[PDB]
Amino acid sequence: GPYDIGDELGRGTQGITYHAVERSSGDNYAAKIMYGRPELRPFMLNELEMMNTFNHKNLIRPYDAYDTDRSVTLIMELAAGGELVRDNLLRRDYYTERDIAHYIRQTLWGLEHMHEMGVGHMGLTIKDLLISVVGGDIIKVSDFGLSRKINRHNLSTLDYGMPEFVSPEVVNKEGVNFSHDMWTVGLITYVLLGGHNPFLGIDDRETLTKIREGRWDFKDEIWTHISDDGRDFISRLLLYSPEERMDVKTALKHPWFFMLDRPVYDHDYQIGTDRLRNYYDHFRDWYAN
């Protein structure tokens, strides 16, 4: 057998991802092993097909696949720096708004590659942003189990997802467009900068009712230290009406990213990691259960 399966690296709704070594080379890969429920097989096959459709620096690449009667294993590119939040931001005492803009721009470049070929990601959460090398700053977007071709003139419902990162149109059982991904980018950006999810309820049902209602604000003190452009970027994505949201190419033109064209000086505001760490502990526990 070509792969030596080692320690658990992450887990999601379809299975657990492990470190894998290709024996014949010594090269390191990620091995996603499906939970033993046969209804997950279509999602594994969809992820394999989608990974083989993309070819972009900011999207995880496929490598190999095999199966038993019950379960599918996918061997894929290893993001050796781990998850952005768990393994990079939360290993620091502070990060900056400029750091986050750098990560989100790359996330948008990955999404843009998908949207250009008519595919929506459909399931983006904070755990799906990865870093390619230890200590690095290159983003890899992952988890294409829910990704699909979107016909903008013949929309369909999206019946699955993590409740803290779905959009109002998902909760309301309406057709889902490319603008759903853009809502989730605004939500991820809000979480990365302010360290909390503005729709979090006491349980999943209440979270969903808060998303259905669609109201949120910048009340926490941290937001007074985020730039006008950063708040404007979020506010042009977290809009109840899907057609009002920025599409991916408009988002890439937003003035928020102009700061990445200048250098990093000694005056960037330093954001502490405590809030994000508290939200991440909650988020991670959702996948333990």
Swiss-Prot record:
Q: Which family does it belong to?
A: Belongs to the protein kinase superfamily. CAMK Ser/Thr protein kinase family.
- This protein's species is Drosophila melanogaster (Fruit fly)
Q: What is this protein called?
A: Protein Obscurin
Protein kinase domain sequence ranges? 3-257
Q: What happens when the gene is disrupted?
A: RNAi-mediated knockdown either in the indirect flight muscles (IFM) or in all muscles prevents flies from flying without affecting jumping and slightly reduces larval crawling. Causes severe defects in IFM sarcomere development and organization resulting in narrower myofibrils. During sarcomere development at the pupal stage, myosin is mislocalized and no regular sarcomeres are formed. In the adult, abnormal localization of myosin in the mid-region of the sarcomere, H zone shifts from the middle of the sarcomere and M lines are less defined.
The Swiss-Prot or TrEMBL note on domains reads: The protein kinase domain 1 binds ATP with high affinity in a Mg(2+)-independent manner. However, lacks canonical protein kinase activity, probably due to the presence of a glycine residue instead of an aspartate residue at position 3306 in the catalytic site pocket. The protein kinase domain 2 is predicted to be catalytically inactive.
List ligand-binding residues for ATP.
Answer: G15, K32, E77, A79, E83, K127, D143
What does this chain do? Structural component of the muscle M line which is involved in assembly and organization of sarcomere. Required for the development and organization of indirect flight muscle sarcomeres by regulating the formation of M line and H zone and the correct assembly of thick and thin filaments in the sarcomere. Lacks serine/threonine-protein kinase activity.
Induction section of the entry: Expression decreases with age.
Q: Which residues of the full protein are shown?
A: 3186 to 3472 of 4218
Tissue note: Expressed in the thoracic muscles including the indirect flight muscles (IFM) (at protein level).
* Subcellular compartments: Cytoplasm, Myofibril, Sarcomere, M line
Assembly state and interactors? Interacts with myosin. May interact (via protein kinase domain 1) with ball. May interact (via protein kinase domain 1 or 2) with mask. May interact (via protein kinase domain 2) with Tm1/tropomyosin-1.
